[PDB]
Design a binder for this molecule. Structure first.
Ligand SMILES: CC(C)=CCC/C(C)=C/CC[C@H](C)CCOP(=O)(O)OP(=O)(O)O
Ligand SMILES: CC(C)=CCC/C(C)=C/CC[C@H](C)CCOP(=O)(O)OP(=O)(O)O
Ligand SMILES: [Mg+2]
Ligand SMILES: [Mg+2]
Ligand SMILES: [Mg+2]
Ligand SMILES: [Mg+2]
Ligand SMILES: [Mg+2]
Ligand SMILES: [Mg+2]
Lengths: 307, 303
């Protein structure tokens, strides 16, 4: 049982609003027409129960935006990774031109699809809770996620599996984890000054947490990705580069995950002293990264998505 | 004296267009009424060293941009607006409008018009993703300058950790690093452009350029009573002599040079085309490190 090795020297938490938020996410999906034919299965999506773990101290209104955003990501992701649009760059470019217009604050038009309308709704709701500087940073992380998904599409279309270095570098954006990390600021109601927000050690803590979450997901989701012939997965990329067995590739992936956990724990104590207020806010942010690491693992072990 | 210790284990270069670009930067600065000894500014001779392989058209934008920063910088560091937050917020609101695409209005100042001209010219050479990354770095430069202004007004000195973190943005070096992509005509994929090792190389090069400037510019900054300088921040934190503060700043500079050349050997292998483009970008960081030092030692600005 290789899944037993996905362990951390810290624990997570869940918002008491978890089930209320999950039911509201299903109602939001229905409202914006994101629930496709494939009804009874929708009851066990449980996207709100991941959000509830990722932002456990958030007010219900803010948690609901995070939950709806996570739902959006899964709906978009399953299109990219399991349907035709993921093998069609020109279709994806056309869609992303609409998303990018909506991220700049353009109102959707009659011809726009459900996902564009739903994105516009999330941007509108975030604009009410967040200042302009935050909105710009979130939008750029979402833009980089679109860029990364266009890159994954070209790989699928050309039948090309990236090397480990390229995959790991791209994975940091293809999973939209940085955009989710931006929501921690709103969940914790913290205003980090520019010099603290972008500090090298904070960036390295963000990178480590992102790698941990993505590589944990890669170990839990290689089976379903193999079924669809999509090798955007640390296990499958390691297998191709090292020409090794699947058990060996899984073992190597878990070793990289364990090393990245140790790196995160180590760098947590390398945060320099700015002032009392800034460091208090900074420790709430870094605590947020730990909640996310645990949320991903705790939710993913209990989800039929990876069964 | 202590200036002799500002050394690098690599060399720079200068564009053959250096003098016509510098002369054209003066002409541009006069045209926009940014001039009010002009021939001794030599802002084009910094640009020519920073982007030595750039085509003349692209180098001219870079030179005009560097001139813009110096004009803006002297107003912040030697003039009243640098000790007036609400006035700076008003000016920055006009700049941020221009950066988003808004055309200047009747009673916008010379700088706002000059910034709009630079944005227009950059839009002809660079795609939207580039313009956004550049705009964000310039926005963080404005934010860093507003932070410096609050410090000046309250007569506050930040600790070394706070100053170094803020200095990375107050110098606009990242905005200048963005221009390397255009100078060198390279298109780095997202995953290489934002790679942790590339970020750490940019941070090291930024630290080196800023701390080199701090050692060469502490005299003129003391005269204006400005403490945004590694030497002066070290002196305040450690309560040491000025010679000891300079020695400590130069040790941090030397240590950062060692870090930069070490992390150059830690760049992963992505593919042939990407690593070819990356090595041109990282070489660009080296050109900038050398350009800053080479230009500053011959500039009357720090005499
Ligand atoms: C769906 C999405 C992009 C984000 C949802 C929120 C989130 C940050 C989840 C953590 C897991 C991981 C980063 C998803 C990566 O996509 P991948 O396609 O490998 O996910 P899958 O294995 O579940 O399909
Ligand atoms: C003027 C400016 C923002 C940039 C021009 C181009 C550039 C990146 C020059 C390198 C020197 C340094 C980063 C300037 C920092 O401002 P500081 O105020 O310490 O400069 P000074 O010492 O020359 O006054
Ligand atoms: Mg997927
Ligand atoms: Mg995916
Ligand atoms: Mg997966
Ligand atoms: Mg200055
Ligand atoms: Mg300055
Ligand atoms: Mg200076």
């Amino acid at each position: 049982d290789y899944r037993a090795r996905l362990v951390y020297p810290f624990s997570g938490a869940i918002s008491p609003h978890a089930d209320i938020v999950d039911q509201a996410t299903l109602a939001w999906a229905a409202m914006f027409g994101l629930l496709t034919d494939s009804r009874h299965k929708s009851r066990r999506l449980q996207y709100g129960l991941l959000a509830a773990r990722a932002y456990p101290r958030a007010d219900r209104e803010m948690l609901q935006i995070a939950a709806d955003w996570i739902a959006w990501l899964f709906f978009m992701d399953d299109q990219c990774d399991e349907t035709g649009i993921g093998r069609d760059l020109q279709r994806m470019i056309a869609l992303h031109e609409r998303f990018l217009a909506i991220l700049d604050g353009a109102t959707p038009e009659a011809h726009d699809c459900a996902l564009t309308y739903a994105l516009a709704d999330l941007r509108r709701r975030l604009a009410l809770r967040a200042p302009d500087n935050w909105l710009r940073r979130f939008s750029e992380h979402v833009r980089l996620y679109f860029t990364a998904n266009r890159w994954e599409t070209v790989n699928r279309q050309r039948g090309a599996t990236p090397n480990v270095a390229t995959y790991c570098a791209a994975r940091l954006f293809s999973g939209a984890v940085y955009a989710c990390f931006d929501l921690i600021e709103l969940a914790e109601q913290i205003e980090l000054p520019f010099y603290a927000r972008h500090h090298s050690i904070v960036q390295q803590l963000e990178q480590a947490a992102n790698n941990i979450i993505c590589w944990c997901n890669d170990v839990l989701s290689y089976p379903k990705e193999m079924q669809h012939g999509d090798r955007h997965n640390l296990v499958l990329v390691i297998q191709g580069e090292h020409q090794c067995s699947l058990p060996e590739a899984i073992d190597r992936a878990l070793d990289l995950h364990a090393r990245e956990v140790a790196t995160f724990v180590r760098k947590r104590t390398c945060v320099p002293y700015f002032d009392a207020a800034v460091n208090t806010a900074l420790e709430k942010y870094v605590t947020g990264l730990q909640f996310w690491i645990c949320a991903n693992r705790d939710w993913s072990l209990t989800a039929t998505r990876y069964a």
